[PDB]
Amino acid sequence: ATPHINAEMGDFADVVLMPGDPLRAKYIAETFLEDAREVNNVRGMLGFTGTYKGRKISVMGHGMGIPSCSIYTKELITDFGVKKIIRVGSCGAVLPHVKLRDVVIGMGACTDSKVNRIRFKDHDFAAIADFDMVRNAVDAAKALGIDARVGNLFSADLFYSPDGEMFDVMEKYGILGVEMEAAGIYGVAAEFGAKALTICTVSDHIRTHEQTTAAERQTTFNDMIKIALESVLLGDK
Amino acid sequence: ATPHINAEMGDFADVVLMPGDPLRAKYIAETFLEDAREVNNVRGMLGFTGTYKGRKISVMGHGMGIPSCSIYTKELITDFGVKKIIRVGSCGAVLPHVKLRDVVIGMGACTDSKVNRIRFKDHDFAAIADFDMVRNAVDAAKALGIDARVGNLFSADLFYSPDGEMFDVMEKYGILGVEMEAAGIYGVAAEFGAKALTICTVSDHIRTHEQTTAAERQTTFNDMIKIALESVLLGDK
Amino acid sequence: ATPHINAEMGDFADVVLMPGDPLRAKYIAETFLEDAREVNNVRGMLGFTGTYKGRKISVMGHGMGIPSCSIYTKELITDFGVKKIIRVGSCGAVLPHVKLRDVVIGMGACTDSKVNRIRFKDHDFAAIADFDMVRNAVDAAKALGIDARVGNLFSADLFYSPDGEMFDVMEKYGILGVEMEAAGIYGVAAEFGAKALTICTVSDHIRTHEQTTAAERQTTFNDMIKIALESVLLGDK
Amino acid sequence: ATPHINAEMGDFADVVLMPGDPLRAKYIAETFLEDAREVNNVRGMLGFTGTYKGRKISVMGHGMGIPSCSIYTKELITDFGVKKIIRVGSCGAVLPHVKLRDVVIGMGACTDSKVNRIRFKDHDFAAIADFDMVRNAVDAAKALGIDARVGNLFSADLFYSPDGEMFDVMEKYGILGVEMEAAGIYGVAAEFGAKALTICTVSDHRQTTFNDMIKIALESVLLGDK
Amino acid sequence: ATPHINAEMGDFADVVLMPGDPLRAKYIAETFLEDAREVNNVRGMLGFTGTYKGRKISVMGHGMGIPSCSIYTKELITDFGVKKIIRVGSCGAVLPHVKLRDVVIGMGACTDSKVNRIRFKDHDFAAIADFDMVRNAVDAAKALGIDARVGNLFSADLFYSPDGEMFDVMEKYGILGVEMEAAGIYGVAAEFGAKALTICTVSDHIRTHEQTTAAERQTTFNDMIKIALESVLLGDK
Amino acid sequence: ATPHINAEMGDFADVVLMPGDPLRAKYIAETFLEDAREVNNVRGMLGFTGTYKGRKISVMGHGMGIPSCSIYTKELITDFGVKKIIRVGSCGAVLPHVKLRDVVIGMGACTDSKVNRIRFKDHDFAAIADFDMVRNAVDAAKALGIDARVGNLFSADLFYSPDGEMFDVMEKYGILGVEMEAAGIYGVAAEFGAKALTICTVSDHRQTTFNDMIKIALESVLLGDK
Numbered sequence A, B, C, E: 001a002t003p004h005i006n007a008e009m010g011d012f013a014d015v016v017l018m019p020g021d022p023l024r025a026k027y028i029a030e031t032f033l034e035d036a037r038e039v040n041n042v043r044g045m046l047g048f049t050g051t052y053k054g055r056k057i058s059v060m061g062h063g064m065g066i067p068s069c070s071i072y073t074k075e076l077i078t079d080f081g082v083k084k085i086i087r088v089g090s091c092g093a094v095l096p097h098v099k100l101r102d103v104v105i106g107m108g109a110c111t112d113s114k115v116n117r118i119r120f121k122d123h124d125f126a127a128i129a130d131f132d133m134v135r136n137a138v139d140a141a142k143a144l145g146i147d148a149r150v151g152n153l154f155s156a157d158l159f160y161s162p163d164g165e166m167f168d169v170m171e172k173y174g175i176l177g178v179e180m181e182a183a184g185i186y187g188v189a190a191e192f193g194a195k196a197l198t199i200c201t202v203s204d205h206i207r208t209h210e211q212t213t214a215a216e217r218q219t220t221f222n223d224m225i226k227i228a229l230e231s232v233l234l235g236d237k
Numbered sequence D, F: 001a002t003p004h005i006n007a008e009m010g011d012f013a014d015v016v017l018m019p020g021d022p023l024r025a026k027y028i029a030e031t032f033l034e035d036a037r038e039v040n041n042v043r044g045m046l047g048f049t050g051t052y053k054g055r056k057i058s059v060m061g062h063g064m065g066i067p068s069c070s071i072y073t074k075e076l077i078t079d080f081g082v083k084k085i086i087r088v089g090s091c092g093a094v095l096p097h098v099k100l101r102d103v104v105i106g107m108g109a110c111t112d113s114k115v116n117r118i119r120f121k122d123h124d125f126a127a128i129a130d131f132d133m134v135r136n137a138v139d140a141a142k143a144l145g146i147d148a149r150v151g152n153l154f155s156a157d158l159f160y161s162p163d164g165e166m167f168d169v170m171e172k173y174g175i176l177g178v179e180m181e182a183a184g185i186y187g188v189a190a191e192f193g194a195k196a197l198t199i200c201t202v203s204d205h206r207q208t209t210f211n212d213m214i215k216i217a218l219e220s221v222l223l224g225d226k
């Protein structure tokens, strides 16, 4: 029971999948988990706990932005005993060879936010994911015939950047996807001694075309979730 | 319809009160607006439009953190003709002479975010509110017989900051309350040509203790609302 | 007597108007204060104390730049019981709809100085003026039938800046005037527990042309003075 | 030939093992490489090219510090077609559980240098290694019955830092070892489209551990070829 | 004729000595120059031109602070053909071996100001004096039996630092004297292609005693001026 | 012995000439020094101590970059009693009037490194040389009928900078030559109470010019002894 979560120790699994959209968490709960129960509803950030193939799993939205997800992941780790957090969201692409519906795994996350500099005496803290979590995800994807890209994500503070001059830079230094919280989650995981990983599905790209079908799009998003769910089972072993 | 708001031009009033919590927006629409109709629920970010003493007005959540509210205030200003934004949120107090439930009006807002430096070529942009709006709010207050301090708020990126020594600095410079989005809303208001004001209810004390569930609905949180709603009326004259 | 002011406690009123130019202070004492007596001349920084409609009040120059006025405002606040400081200076306009002789009231002040970052642990401190003082000045104006915009000023370190592209940035964010000390006076006022306000007369246009010698004395520079002096009277009530 | 490498395209393998110490490149050529030949000597920074189990491989030191390794890394990549760079060196530890001689693999590298900020418009660039190369190093170590820690490294610009308070910070955020070039090499790999990885053995808080690291590095390349 | 100087080309010598105090410039003029004439009086910043041993020399105050002296030295160089500027002021000492009345020559100047970073793409610009000017000063002092110290000065933006933690740092890295404009003058000299040098006499030190006599103090200040005047004669050769 | 110098107090003179290239230390020992003896070899960074006209002097390279030279500079100063350090190297020019082979003396050194900011609480530290040493170098060059420019140097962290726009800035503020360690050495000298100077010959915009620089450096020490 924290100011942002009305639950108690035991209410969450030691592993939590986190989409940015609270309505997405209910979607995941109802689609992949059995015997799911809502364990939080404060300010509409729905959280759920259930089981995936006999394994206890939790799913809860983290909202948009590093400041938002930082609050939730921190409380989950320090107040609910959560050991692993897997963010499952969307991202925009800047690289020409990265196409719509590609599954991206952020082994690292670049950012224009100042949270990690505030943490790291103003120096460069490399916000990285937990290695084992990354390989578990890579292997799970492989078992599903889904080949994922592993690299750098860029966590933006401004979805509407005042000057898109930064997109050429991201492209130049090869970041795979553009989103808004990976660098924040990794900073939190490092600060409170937990493990985190964010997986994204490319929903848009700079230099668009047509629009792609929702069915195929929704299919890839489900694969991403399965990869996430299945990767934790591999970790349990 | 914008990326995060499934609404059409005209569904929102030219003035929108915005708490961080979607459920508080629902509460405000139910408790203060006559004939309130829901105009958004995309990521659970409820938006409503109704009337207050014949005046058409809207209320919608903006989520936690500068990145979140920046998205919403921006789409509202550019795609829904919104002219004024009044944040009605909660905050933490750092000064000893500031008690819980106190109402604070942020004429200015300090921040540890990099967002404004990214806009102002890495210099110091003074994130200020629209003068008339502050005066309207101060007058509305006096007319309702409610106390309210006018001053600097501090918009933090990390609700759980690793640097507690900064609270001493905030206090020394008399910042009235610690919240998480004022400086970002003022930056958007300026970047996109709109006006804004942040009103907060001290929901906890950084040096002492906090509160719970009342943040979604409390007479003092009702005072903040009355002031906000009444100040709009004064602005129309 | 302080390092830069050869005066004793009581030689200054609790309110001091301060232009950058020592000669303008002399002009103000001669043209507006009854029974004005000189209380300082150490580095040629003339200070005077007299009365305006029975109200005891002082006027003294603060020199050019944040480092200069920081010295004077500080000694005044800590060693001469000064409670209020009203800067009555000149500035450059960057917006097209701002003509020469216009009166600007800085509720806020952006800056490229590092002074406030040194005070606020390298974060963004919103250098703001005392709310009541701004309101007093706005009311005094209306009562004198003089126009006056209220907004952000930009306090520059270099009058001859190598970065002209920054004027475009200032303009974009609607800063009302470019001067050189407002943000420093507000920082001192906050650091040393006093209140302050900056009123400026647009003495030139960054995009167009300037003026000369009138800055030491002009009806419009007289308007700034009347507003300042009258606002004090309103503050006393 | 480039300003710091008197050689031509083809002289270097597409993979280059890089120790800090120049003296160690020759020791690696004679000890692990077959049919090695000298391909550089410009400033005593000796380079060699040979094979390891048929695989073409080169060895050459990079010098101490980001500025130094950045020069060699960049030149090899843009002028000699090098596709992968594996730095093999030593580091100091700040974590109690990290013991001397432990093998550490830098999936990422923090730094107090401005080098990447200058590249990333003053924002935070996560200097990271290539995942496959990381995984290959881990699998190779395992096959050699060696436990390798995978985490963050810290690339210091000042070996003798004026403030030791930063070591508490490194320990708090779990960095595995303190060295001086990983973040620099990662920046270059990112900037010029190539892959990189640095493997280090904890020297403070030897030939065997050193030979172990090279074996790991070399064996990881063959795995990567699969 | 610029907004800060009411003179015309030819009114100044191609070499100007500059104390911070306008009243000090009149002192220098009347004490060492013959046939001296006031060539500026705008905002009280007295400037004078005369001859020293047949050589045409000018003397004018620059006010306190980098922003102030930056305006004057810039206009002198670009609008009055001034080739050399020699600042002659006072400074405080932090080193134990640097005693009261020591003559310090700033071959370099450290600063907490942001002016040079703004000029130098945010990197480290080493603000240095003109070598020949430095050796001319060292040799002149020698001819007068005055041995001067040559090293780094620290140009502060805040005479009243919010946290004197920087004084141990200055001492640690060996800066000889603490003043307020050297780094600014050198930045200007570099930007507009001129030559500058600042010479200071230690007027105070951290860890005081007695107070020293004004006569001896005034004697050393005069020596500093003679060194300045005489060093330019050596440059002419 | 220190981490990077296997020697004892007394082995080094109180003055040390430091070229970047290790190979150049031995060439200087055999060409200009009398009775030279080897005093270091830890990473091929050879050091020698001998005399020049009776004066005791040492020579040893510092490597490329601030991080590298900072290590050697610091160790020599705090553990071997070195009082003066003279770096002798090459640089690139951005000013039209500065010609190839010109001799440049860095009275000051700008930089894009964070090294001094970390030392100076993130403020601006003017990395400068010792005045006397500067004047001695100038007087020695004169006596050798050589014109030496005295001004600012720029110590780059990235030999291959991602933005060339900075070279216009260097030219605008009159920096004489672009190199990679002057600001680093000056920081160390300041931090540990010693004196330093870097002299460079413009290599781009040779043995003779190089020998000229060493002669200048060596002759400047004798002047400094007066």
Ligand SMILES: O=c1[nH]cnc2c([C@@H]3O[C@H](CO)[C@@H](O)[C@H]3O)n[nH]c12
Residues within 6 Å of the ligand: A020, A063, A064, A065, A089, A090, A091, A092, A093, A156, A159, A178, A179, A180, A181, A203, A204
């Ligand atoms: O192109 C993009 N840019 C920035 N964020 C996102 C996102 C994700 O969607 C949300 C905002 O649209 C954020 O929570 C972010 O994680 N998807 N596509 C993009």
Ligand SMILES: O=c1[nH]cnc2c([C@@H]3O[C@H](CO)[C@@H](O)[C@H]3O)n[nH]c12
Residues within 6 Å of the ligand: A003, B020, B063, B064, B065, B089, B090, B091, B092, B093, B156, B159, B178, B179, B180, B181, B203, B204, B206
């Ligand atoms: O003590 C506090 N610190 C930081 N933010 C807040 C808030 C506000 O509440 C939300 C997080 O609890 C944010 O939207 C923030 O603006 N209330 N109390 C505090």
Ligand SMILES: O=c1[nH]cnc2c([C@@H]3O[C@H](CO)[C@@H](O)[C@H]3O)n[nH]c12
Residues within 6 Å of the ligand: C020, C063, C064, C065, C089, C090, C091, C092, C093, C156, C159, C178, C179, C180, C181, C203, C204, C206, E003
């Ligand atoms: O266009 C301008 N730019 C910067 N400062 C000023 C000023 C003010 O006048 C003085 C310098 O001319 C400073 O004190 C500054 O506040 N007037 N016009 C301008």
Ligand SMILES: O=c1[nH]cnc2c([C@@H]3O[C@H](CO)[C@@H](O)[C@H]3O)n[nH]c12
Residues within 6 Å of the ligand: D020, D063, D064, D065, D089, D090, D091, D092, D093, D156, D159, D178, D179, D180, D181, D203, D204, F003
């Ligand atoms: O404790 C340490 N600190 C910093 N660097 C190192 C190193 C490595 O040794 C060299 C400097 O001694 C650097 O090139 C660095 O990679 N080993 N142990 C340490």
Ligand SMILES: O=c1[nH]cnc2c([C@@H]3O[C@H](CO)[C@@H](O)[C@H]3O)n[nH]c12
Residues within 6 Å of the ligand: E020, E063, E064, E065, E089, E090, E091, E092, E093, E156, E159, E178, E179, E180, E181, E203, E204
């Ligand atoms: O101890 C000191 N600190 C900072 N400045 C000064 C000065 C000089 O005196 C003026 C302020 O007192 C400034 O113009 C500065 O150059 N003298 N002594 C000191």
Ligand SMILES: O=c1[nH]cnc2c([C@@H]3O[C@H](CO)[C@@H](O)[C@H]3O)n[nH]c12
Residues within 6 Å of the ligand: D003, F020, F063, F064, F065, F089, F090, F091, F092, F093, F156, F159, F178, F179, F180, F181, F203, F204
């Ligand atoms: O044009 C140049 N740019 C940067 N450094 C140098 C150098 C020197 O050469 C080495 C790198 O090539 C560095 O150690 C530096 O001191 N010479 N010419 C140049």
